[PDB]
Write a protein that binds this ligand. Structure first.
Ligand SMILES: *[C@@H]1O[C@H](CO)[C@@H](O[C@@H]2O[C@H](CO)[C@@H](O)[C@H](O)[C@H]2NC(C)=O)[C@H](O)[C@H]1NC(C)=O
Ligand SMILES: *[C@@H]1O[C@H](CO)[C@@H](O[C@@H]2O[C@H](CO)[C@@H](O)[C@H](O)[C@H]2NC(C)=O)[C@H](O)[C@H]1NC(C)=O
Ligand SMILES: *[C@@H]1O[C@H](CO)[C@@H](O)[C@H](O)[C@H]1NC(C)=O
Ligand SMILES: *[C@@H]1O[C@H](CO)[C@@H](O)[C@H](O)[C@H]1NC(C)=O
Lengths: 91, 108, 9
């Protein structure tokens, strides 16, 4: 990380803000479009509708979701909540 | 991986030291919005379609496929039953048609 | 098919 004897560092041509904006656009498109933004124009599908499709894509029906919506939301929010503790407590 | 969108099949062609690809690709166009619901309540049980959803064109409740506006009448052959009307959210009141009772009653 | 064939019609 020094600048001596003829070696010179070059800055990134796309800095971290637009990288964060591209990942934010990815997350926004997949939270409010399903897979439709990844193929053509984005289409409006609700996220429990999309997760019912992805349950239908994995081979289980709708009634494991629509009868268990708060349980799936609790497991999902607890599962994403332990991501921060797993990364923060492991160097 | 092949094309940009929903792939169908591909055309292989030659280059002097390489290869060029052609990809016929399904892209949707001219999209409309409707009113959806996960289930339809009829006679105290929860109804769910075979390979689609419940849609309505403002008034009349229809069953269509996922990638096209091709509506159908809610009938007992393109719709299976699971559970009751209470444990599911988003369920509204409509009817599911019987294709056997006029032929049973009014003729024989 | 048989219960509505028998008990109703
Ligand atoms: C929604 O779909 C229904 C069903 O096709 C449409 O109702 C039809 O309207 C025409 C014109 O008035 C009638 O001749 C048909 O008999 C109706 N169908 C039935 C099954 O009764 C309706 O026009 C559509 N649009 C709206 C805004 O409700
Ligand atoms: C769907 O239809 C059912 C059947 O009529 C409705 O249940 C009735 O609701 C009223 C309103 O409180 C009660 O007075 C009746 O006793 C209920 N019927 C029975 C058999 O329990 C239900 O409310 C309707 N749902 C919606 C969203 O309209
Ligand atoms: C479609 O969207 C418009 C506004 O963008 C809304 O007024 C209309 O009610 C929607 N259609 C249905 C069937 O809900
Ligand atoms: C959908 O959201 C609206 C708020 O605009 C709410 O009134 C309604 O109950 C919701 N439907 C379900 C099935 O939760």
């Amino acid at each position: 990380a020094q600048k001596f004897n003829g070696l010179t560092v070059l800055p990134p041509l796309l800095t971290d803000e637009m990288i964060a904006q591209y990942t934010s656009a990815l997350l926004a498109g997949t939270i409010t479009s399903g897979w439709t933004f990844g193929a053509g124009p984005a289409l409006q599908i609700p996220f429990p509708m999309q997760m019912a499709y992805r349950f239908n894509g994995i081979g289980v029906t709708q009634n494991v979701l629509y009868e268990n919506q708060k349980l799936i939301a609790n497991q999902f929010n607890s599962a994403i909540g332990k991501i921060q503790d797993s990364l923060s407590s492991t160097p | 991986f092949c094309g940009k969108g929903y792939h169908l099949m591909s055309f292989p062609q030659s280059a002097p030291h390489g290869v060029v690809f052609l990809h016929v690709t399904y892209v949707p166009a001219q999209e409309k919005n409707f009113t959806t619901a996960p289930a339809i309540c009829h006679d105290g049980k929860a109804h769910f379609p075979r390979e689609g959803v419940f849609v309505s064109n403002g008034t009349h409740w229809f069953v269509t496929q996922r990638n096209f506006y091709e509506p159908q009448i809610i009938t007992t052959d393109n719709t299976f039953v699971s559970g009751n009307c209470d444990v599911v959210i988003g369920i509204v009141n409509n009817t599911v048609y019987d294709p056997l009772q006029p032929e049973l009653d009014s003729f024989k």
